[PDB]
Each structure stands twice: as structure tokens, then as C-alpha cells.
Amino acid sequence: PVNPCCYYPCQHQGICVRFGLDRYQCDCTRTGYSGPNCTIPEIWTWLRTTLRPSPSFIHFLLTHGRWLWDFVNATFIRDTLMRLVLTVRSNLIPSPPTYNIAHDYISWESFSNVSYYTRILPSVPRDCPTPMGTKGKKQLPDAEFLSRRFLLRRKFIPDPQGTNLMFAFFAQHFTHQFFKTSGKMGPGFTKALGHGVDLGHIYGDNLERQYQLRLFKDGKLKYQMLNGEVYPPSVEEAPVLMHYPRGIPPQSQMAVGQEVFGLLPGLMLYATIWLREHNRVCDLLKAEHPTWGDEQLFQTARLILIGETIKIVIEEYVQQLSGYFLQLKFDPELLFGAQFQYRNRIAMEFNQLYHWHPLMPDSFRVGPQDYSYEQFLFNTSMLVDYGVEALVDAFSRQPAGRIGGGRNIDHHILHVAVDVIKESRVLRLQPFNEYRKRFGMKPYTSFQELTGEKEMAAELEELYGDIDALEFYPGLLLEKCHPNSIFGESMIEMGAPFSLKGLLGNPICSPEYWKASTFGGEVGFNLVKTATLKKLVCLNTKTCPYVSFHVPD
Amino acid sequence: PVNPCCYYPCQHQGICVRFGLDRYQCDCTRTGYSGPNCTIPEIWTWLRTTLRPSPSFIHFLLTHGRWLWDFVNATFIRDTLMRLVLTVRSNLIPSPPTYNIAHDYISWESFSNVSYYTRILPSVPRDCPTPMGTKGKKQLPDAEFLSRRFLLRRKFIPDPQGTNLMFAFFAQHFTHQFFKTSGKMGPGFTKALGHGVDLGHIYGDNLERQYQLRLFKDGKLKYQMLNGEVYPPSVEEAPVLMHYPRGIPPQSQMAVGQEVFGLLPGLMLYATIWLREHNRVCDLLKAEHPTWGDEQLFQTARLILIGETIKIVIEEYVQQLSGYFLQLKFDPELLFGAQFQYRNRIAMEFNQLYHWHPLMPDSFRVGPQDYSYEQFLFNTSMLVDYGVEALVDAFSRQPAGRIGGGRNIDHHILHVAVDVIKESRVLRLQPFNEYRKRFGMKPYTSFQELTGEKEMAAELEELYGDIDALEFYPGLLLEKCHPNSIFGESMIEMGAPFSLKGLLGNPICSPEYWKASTFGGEVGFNLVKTATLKKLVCLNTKTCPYVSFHVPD
Numbered sequence A, B: 001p002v003n004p005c006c007y008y009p010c011q012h013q014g015i016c017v018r019f020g021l022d023r024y025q026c027d028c029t030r031t032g033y034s035g036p037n038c039t040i041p042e043i044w045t046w047l048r049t050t051l052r053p054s055p056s057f058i059h060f061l062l063t064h065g066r067w068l069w070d071f072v073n074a075t076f077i078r079d080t081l082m083r084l085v086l087t088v089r090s091n092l093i094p095s096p097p098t099y100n101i102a103h104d105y106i107s108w109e110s111f112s113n114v115s116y117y118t119r120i121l122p123s124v125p126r127d128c129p130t131p132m133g134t135k136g137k138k139q140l141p142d143a144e145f146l147s148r149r150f151l152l153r154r155k156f157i158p159d160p161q162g163t164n165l166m167f168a169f170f171a172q173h174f175t176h177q178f179f180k181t182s183g184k185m186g187p188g189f190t191k192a193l194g195h196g197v198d199l200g201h202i203y204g205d206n207l208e209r210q211y212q213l214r215l216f217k218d219g220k221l222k223y224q225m226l227n228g229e230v231y232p233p234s235v236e237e238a239p240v241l242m243h244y245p246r247g248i249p250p251q252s253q254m255a256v257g258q259e260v261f262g263l264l265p266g267l268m269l270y271a272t273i274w275l276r277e278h279n280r281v282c283d284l285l286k287a288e289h290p291t292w293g294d295e296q297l298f299q300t301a302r303l304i305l306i307g308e309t310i311k312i313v314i315e316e317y318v319q320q321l322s323g324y325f326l327q328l329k330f331d332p333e334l335l336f337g338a339q340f341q342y343r344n345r346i347a348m349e350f351n352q353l354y355h356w357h358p359l360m361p362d363s364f365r366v367g368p369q370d371y372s373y374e375q376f377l378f379n380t381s382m383l384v385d386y387g388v389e390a391l392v393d394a395f396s397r398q399p400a401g402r403i404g405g406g407r408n409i410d411h412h413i414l415h416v417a418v419d420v421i422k423e424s425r426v427l428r429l430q431p432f433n434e435y436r437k438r439f440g441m442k443p444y445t446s447f448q449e450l451t452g453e454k455e456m457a458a459e460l461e462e463l464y465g466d467i468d469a470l471e472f473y474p475g476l477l478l479e480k481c482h483p484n485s486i487f488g489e490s491m492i493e494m495g496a497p498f499s500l501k502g503l504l505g506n507p508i509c510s511p512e513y514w515k516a517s518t519f520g521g522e523v524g525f526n527l528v529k530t531a532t533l534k535k536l537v538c539l540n541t542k543t544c545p546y547v548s549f550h551v552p553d
Ligand SMILES: *[C@@H]1O[C@H](CO)[C@@H](O[C@H]2O[C@H](CO)[C@@H](O[C@@H]3O[C@H](CO[C@@H]4O[C@H](CO[C@@H]5O[C@H](CO)[C@@H](O)[C@H](O)[C@@H]5O)[C@@H](O)[C@H](O)[C@@H]4O)[C@@H](O)[C@H](O)[C@@H]3O)[C@H](O)[C@H]2NC(C)=O)[C@H](O)[C@H]1NC(C)=O
Pocket: A113, A115, A116, A184, A185, A186, B206, B207, B208, B211, B212, B239
């Protein structure tokens, strides 16, 4: 008796449940559809899907007609559209969360145990005929071969949207606060229990670590002075676990919230900027509240930095990534009149989707000097040698690589993609086409439709045998990009829901928290409301360099 | 300089914040008022409070005109009113939670660390002139004296609403799943991390314990047979820590989710009933899903019992307690059109308010036998000696004591009340009158108004010196009771918000979870929708005894 749920019979978010020895039933509750397979639409459902323009057409609208968008951005329409974007995208993410690596069904354990990443679609049942369900071959393509053939960079392909390394390192720094897969527990488990923008990559993911990083004076974080500049303290002064190669003296190791940030100067650079910002805010708070103790100063500054982070991510980071002419806006009040849960649980699919390694260049240019990967990775003196401004200027000027399209991952880090594919099979992620449907898109009917070309498509078809066997991550990276864009429609249609839900799902965005008193008053509240990448850097450096998520002109 | 917030200047939920060396500012955001102290109403705010009838009047309407209610209860008006009750009561509880014993302000730590109970009103600042703020004497009345004088029972006072011991033990059993103050960490901390109806008192508050309790076959819980009846297993078979007097061997201990249930036959009675219900549901589930494994059977049965619990608590437990002619209803769908957060955090005030020791009798009667506290407490054989049916019958027949009114706590357990008062001072809970205002009532202007009499009021005035110095717990237990009611209005006006938010705030009540598939299909969903105290007992016992939360007529 072949498990009927292996055919993914239930459509439009209907839930497949096994009944008896060989039957199945689809729970169509609130899907907007009825029938054995949740395929019979109600009137409003049918109209909505019949009138909704394609993701590609909407993408076109949002990236053309600057004159019209400028006009619209200056009106209430900006708010109307931002609210629509927030609600429509977020609603595709279940909240409270549903499944995890252990339970392909709702359970109290999945709801309460936050050491688990959640998941949007249940796993491919273990008893299915093929690894992907019922389609494809008995054995999936070799992960290594797949990576060498379709993901390995031949010649660097710059991002057409002008994205730079300042952006690339921000993305890596930012995402590493909520993606922290546990080596000890295995795939499907995380150590970032905050499951969102808690800034645990600055303050630590646990209390004792936070306490080791804190000065416990004026609400500040410990630090050290080098060349008259402020930097994170060494592991000697802040006895915290850091992942550095054996053989590196403790005095040369910097201690920050995230244990892996010693890996790249680009990561430690952001750790330095944010640490400086935290202490700068502590100073502003104390001037306003001389009676406050160290604890309240520390806690309030953290809330302010969380807000500054979400503000910058929405209005500058996502703005650069989307390429939209619509001026995005971070305003929690846009959701006060809607039904929305202020909670977030990080999905394993979101983790996979965010492996944007193609962004990394062939080498790292700092002024007239060109640094190789061996001169960059784990280099513990470069940040201090050049200082914050110099590195920000260089990273802001160097272009990052295009993410989608294929063949654009530097050989130095290709092994990461190989492991992502291997872990996807351990997590038993459903095929790319099933995720397409889950996020409102039609499944691809062939590999040529996916790639937009013929040679790679033919080889993929040979390897996978069926488009319905194509895996999640490979599909995301091999999909044809939007015209002159950094990646394809799926990265946007699937990634936007996860990202936006994770930003606005934060408790500081709730009516209960979003008030001036939460941030120590008007001064703190305005810091959040007017935060900018430029101010983040320049209010914390001697001089102000070129700073942006876009390469200069 | 005297801390200005010691005067509780900000009204209507405005937040008091210290500015400069001696100033304060009230954050009136979304309170519906403006002005230095949030006292100037907006037009709609003024209308709402002017047309709003008093709690006493509303109570009258709900306990009179049975003929009218009988009509209402059979129409959709029942739903309209239940939704109104749910939303208006729940809106008084902040969500996400705000403060805790360490932070009298919003912070990421308060939001994320669930080992802390939350609190609704901040503590009395440690630097205030008097223990309660600015009113009263420099020293509060001795806790032991206060208890002896006003809380000690002199003559048993039965509850005029007919509440029985079956109800009392349900209340004790039920609340002990979310009130588990940590002896190690101290006041302000809890071990019940589920913060609500997770049934941790049946399955254990931690995974390791749950695993020792589970059979790992058919999704069931371990059990043992005695006199042909099913009971919880022994600690020898289920190696779990249970709090029993030293000298009682593991083979003679019963292992259940909550460590302290061996203390009373009444507690183990419910532990036994729910254990039998769990395994019963597993049988029903397996019949429907023969392909399911032990894990899914166990998790699904747990979800069903959670739903059954909420159903019985709202429609029978709270119904009995309220004495309303309005037929309360548990229907999550009532809130699907409203803005509501599906989460809960247990408040320290809710813990205090739920110390209903007056309910306990002078002795426990089982048929012709009358057992004393010395014979009842920690009795290791009574449950098995009599069996479930006999104890349910006896407890359903014996009257429980009136909660409010004062002087009704049996001397055997008066020490608990003494400790509650002492814990209250450690927690630095604000005065009863501040809580009255926080929950929408006018503060009492004198002790005579509070008690409704002259004798106790006169002595209370002498001891406290000022009505605004009266503490939270004593205030709840000494306030005059509603006509022929089990307690006063404050217990209802303050208790209803916490209780209802805790019941509906459960994730199973969310649109995401409230579906047939969550409970294994229609059979499981109906078990929840039709749950009853009588069925809970009789579908798990040989014979059907008198079972109710009210003594027989
Ligand atoms: C979140 O969710 C994750 C995933 O579930 C949790 O992972 C960890 O917790 C699990 C439970 O502790 C770990 O499971 C392992 O199970 C092994 C097998 O043990 C079996 O259970 C008992 C063992 O007890 C037996 O009897 C006596 C009684 O006193 C006992 O002393 C003795 O040890 C004896 O074995 C028994 O019925 C069986 O025969 C088995 O022994 C354990 O050996 C192992 O130590 C562990 O407990 C799981 O491995 C943990 N780690 C991971 C990554 O899975 C995580 O804890 C959850 N987080 C939270 C906060 O809840």
C-alpha cells in the first residue's frame, strides 16, 4: 500500500491525513476550497486567483515608471501598498508554527520546543517510492556533481542591481543572529532561540555569555582601545567561546555575541559598528535618565538597536534587494488595524533559501590592495589595520555577485552549497514545485521553463528525470532571474513572506511595545524611526566614508 | 528627592518614567487619555466610560431574569455576548507581556525569559517613603497576625453557590499546571514554562520527565492495575521525582506529571481520571489511524485533552463559579474576526489571586467515614481503597467553603496565607486600590466600603492606617461578597481577564490549529467540542456516580 500522501494530493494548503490502512482525507478548513483535494474554489477565491496578475507582471510594475512612483510615494497610497505587502506576504506563513523535523503534524512539542526550526511543508514521507515522493529516480543526483556542474563560478557575474559587499556582509551578519544550526543536535535544530531579530549576534544567544560581554557600568558592552579606536574586547577580558583556529593567541581573538564572527573581517566590522552604536545610545539614555541603573540602560539600548535594525533592513536592505520604485516603509502602526500575530519561528526552508554565497567575490579589494581568500578568512589584524571607515568604504565600492542564474559561487565556498543540498535530503524537503504551489505560484512544467535556456535544462532533465523531482535549493539558484535582477521570482515570492513576517512579527512592533516609553522616551523612539545605514556608521566613526548597499556611480 | 513614581501619578495604564534628577513623564500612548497624568479623556473614551454600567449592575443583569436568558441562550445572542466577554476581559491583559520581578519596564529579557512570572503593574519602587508607596505606616501589619485576625476560620462558612469539593480539587489540580513557583530561584520564578493549559501536570513540565511517564506503545502513558482498576504507575516503574515524605519507597509512590500531587488523594484522583482519559483517546485514535506510530498517537491525544480541558473549564468550571444565567461557551471561532494574540504569560498577581484555600473543609467525608487532615494529607491508600467512583461521589457531595468574606481558612493551612502575604511584600506588589483602578474599578475610599461592615473595617484601619495601603491578597479575601456569591467583585473583575486570556490564548484556539486534522479528524475534534465533566469521569469508570461542581439539590 503506497502512502497516498506521497502524491501530495491535497492542494492549496489542505492537510493530508492518513485514515485506515490505505485511505487519506484532505482537511480543507479555511483554504477557500472544498472537494476531496481542496481544489473546488469558492466564489471569492476564484475571483482573487483569476484577477491576480503574475508575480512577473507585478515585478514589472514595481520597477518601471519612476515618475508615477515618485508621485505615489508622496501620498497615503504608499501606506496602503505597504500594508497590503505586509499582510499578503505574512499571511502565507503559519503562526503559530506548525511542523518540525520530528513532527509532520501539529503537536504541543512542536509549538513549545524552540530548539527546533519549524517547516512550512511536511517532509517527504519516509515510506515513499522515490526520495522526492513518487517522481524522479530512485537516487538523487550526486550533490557534489550537481554543485560543480551548475553552481560553481567560472567567471564572476556581478549583480546587475549594483549590490555591493557592504550589503553582502550585512546580510551575513544579520542572518547569523537567527540561523545557528546546532552541530551537536543536528539538522533541524537551532541555538538561536530568539528565532528572529533579537540581536543575539551582538548580545549573545544565552544569558551567561551576555553577562561576560557586558561592562555592567552605564549599561555598556565591554570594549578595548586600539589605535585610539573602539573595538570589541579580547577573549581574555571577555571569557567567551569564540570559534578561532587552534593556535591563535587569545589576545588576538575578539569576543562578540556570535561565536563565528572571527571568520571574516567583514563580520567583525559590523560587530564593531553595532557595539559602538550600543554604547553611543547608552550615553544618550543616561543624559536623559540620570537615575537609571546599568540594567535598564542596557536593556533599553538593546530595544533601540533592535528597532534601528528592523528600520534599516526594511527601508534600505530590502529596498536595495527588491529594486522596487515603491518606497518601502517600516511602520508598525500599519498593522494595528489588522489581524496579525507578533511571533516568529524560523523555518528550515528560510535557512536554505538564505544561503547567498554567490554574493562573495573572487577576491577582496581594499584600496590599491587586492586580498585573496587566504589573506581574508580568519585574518585577525585587517579590521584594526584599516579601521572601520576604510573597510566600509572599500566594501561599499566593491560589487557583489549575482545570486540567481547559476554558476556563480566561488570555488572557495562551493562546499557549503554541497552540504546544503545534502542536508536538504536529510530534512527530506519536498520538491521545488511543491513549494512553488505553497507560495502561490504555478509549478514549472519543464527544466527549460525553469532556466529559460536549453543546455543546462537538458542536462538537469537527464540527471533528475522529472521537473517534479527538482529540489528546493537547486531550484532557487537555477531559476532564471527577473530581467536585470539579482535573482528569480521564487526567491522573492518565497523569501518575502519569511523575511517580512520575521521583521514585523517582532514583539517591539506590537501595540503594547511600540511606544516612546519602551525606548526611553522620544529621543530613543526617534533613533529607531530615523535610523539609517549612513548614520549607523558615520555617527560612530572619525570620518564618514562612502556608505551604501549600492555601488557608487 | 522622593521618587515621583512612588505616587502612582499616571492613570489609565499610562506609563511612569523618570526623567532628569526629579521629574517624571507619563506615556499616554493609546490609553484614550492625554495630559500630564493621562486623565483628560478623548471624546469616545468619555462616552464609553459614561455609558458603561458598574460591575455590580452588570452582575445583577447576569444573575436575574432567567426567562430572558433562556431565550438568549438558544440564539446567536449567546455568541455575541460570549465574544464580547472574551474580548473585553482579555484586552486588560498585556500581550506580549510587559514586566517581571527584575524589570519594571519592557525589555528583551522580560519578553524572552519564561522562567519569570510576568506582572501587570510594576513593583513599588524600592526607594519609596513607605512599603506601599507613599501611604500607610513605615511598617506593614505582621503577616501572621493579619491572617489570625481576619483569615482564620472560626466556624465553617459554606459557599452559598453550592460549590463542592469536586470543584475545589479540580481547581487545585488544574491551576497547578501553570503555578509552579521555583523554590531554588525564589519568588517571581516558575518551572511551568508552558505558562498556561499545556497539561504539564499530566505529561510533565520537561521532556525527560514526559519520556519516563510514557509507555512508548500506542501513544499511551504508563499505568498499573490495582483491584482490576487503572492507576498511575509507581515511581519504581516510572523513575520520576515525586515529593513524598522521606521513607515512602518508590514502589509505593505514584508517578504523575506534577511532583506534588502525592500530597492529596483529591489530586491523584484527577491525575488518575486524566490518565485514563488519555489512554482512552489513544484507543479511539488508533482505530481511526492504524498506520500512526506511538509519537503521533501521543501528541494528538495530548492536544485533544488540552481542548477537553479548556471546554470543561469554560462551560462548567467558570459557569459554576460565575453563577451567570448566560450560558458560557467555548468556541475559538468567536475570536477569528477579532484582533487577539494567541499566547499567554502567567502573572504573579494571578498566582496570588488563585490561593483559594478557604474552599477546603474542616474534614473530609467519604460515605459514613469522616477523615481529618492528618488522615487525608499524604494518605497513600485512600484513592485505591475507595476507587475513583466513590471518591468522585463523595467530593461531589461535600460543600466547599466560601472564598470571599474573610475568616474562612482552616487552621491546618493558614500558614499558606501567611506566606502569600510575605511573598507579596518580597514581590513588592502595589496596593489593592491600584489594582482596582488597573482593572477598571474605582478605588475604595475606606475599609467600611471595602468590607461592607464596621468591626473588621475598624481594626483594619487601625493596622494599615490608610485604605490606600491595603495589600492585594488581603483586599481580595476581605472585600464584601456579591449577594449570595462565592466571592467579591474584585475576584471576578481581576480574575476573569487572567483566566479568559489564559484559556483562549492557547495556540490550539488559533485559526491555524483549530481544525479537525489537528485532533486526528472529526472524531477527535468532536471529543473536544462535546467534552463534559460527567463524561470525563463516567467514560473512564465502571459505574457512574454523582458527578458535578455543585452539591446535589
Ligand atoms: C527539544 O526536543 C529535542 C528533541 O526531542 C530534545 O532532545 C534531547 O532530549 C531527548 C530526551 O531527553 C534526548 O533523548 C535521548 O534518549 C535516550 C534514550 O533514553 C530512553 O528513555 C528512557 C531512559 O531512562 C531509562 O530509565 C532510567 C530511569 O531513571 C534512566 O535513569 C536510564 O537512563 C534509562 O535509560 C528509557 O525508557 C529508554 O530505555 C531509553 O533509555 C537517552 O539515553 C539520551 O540521553 C537522551 O535522553 C535527545 O537525545 C536529546 N537531544 C537531541 C538532540 O535529541 C530537547 O531536549 C528538547 N528541548 C527541550 C527544552 O525540551
